[PDB]
User: Fold Protein RecA from Escherichia coli.
Amino acid sequence: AARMMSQAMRKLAGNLKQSNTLLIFINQIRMKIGVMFGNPETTTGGNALKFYASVR
DNA sequence: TTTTTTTTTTTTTTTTTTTTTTTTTTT
Assistant:
């Protein structure tokens, strides 16, 4: 799923800018197990979306 | 090269405090 999302962002980012189209992804929260330091909260679908997003 | 994923489950009692009020003559 993380790989699928990483391939999709690469392709979309160029096309969206060219057509002046806004894309909104809704995402859910998950817990990371075995965490002492920081927030245990994360999101689904890997790390690519965090990078490519202009607003979160 | 290429990329994360997702919570689990309650445990166990502690200690006493303080007195109120008279009643009735017998030859």
Notes: Residues 1-6, 30-34, 40, 42, 44-48 of chain A lie near DNA strand B (CB under 10 Å from a C1'). The longest strand of chain A covers residues 29-31.
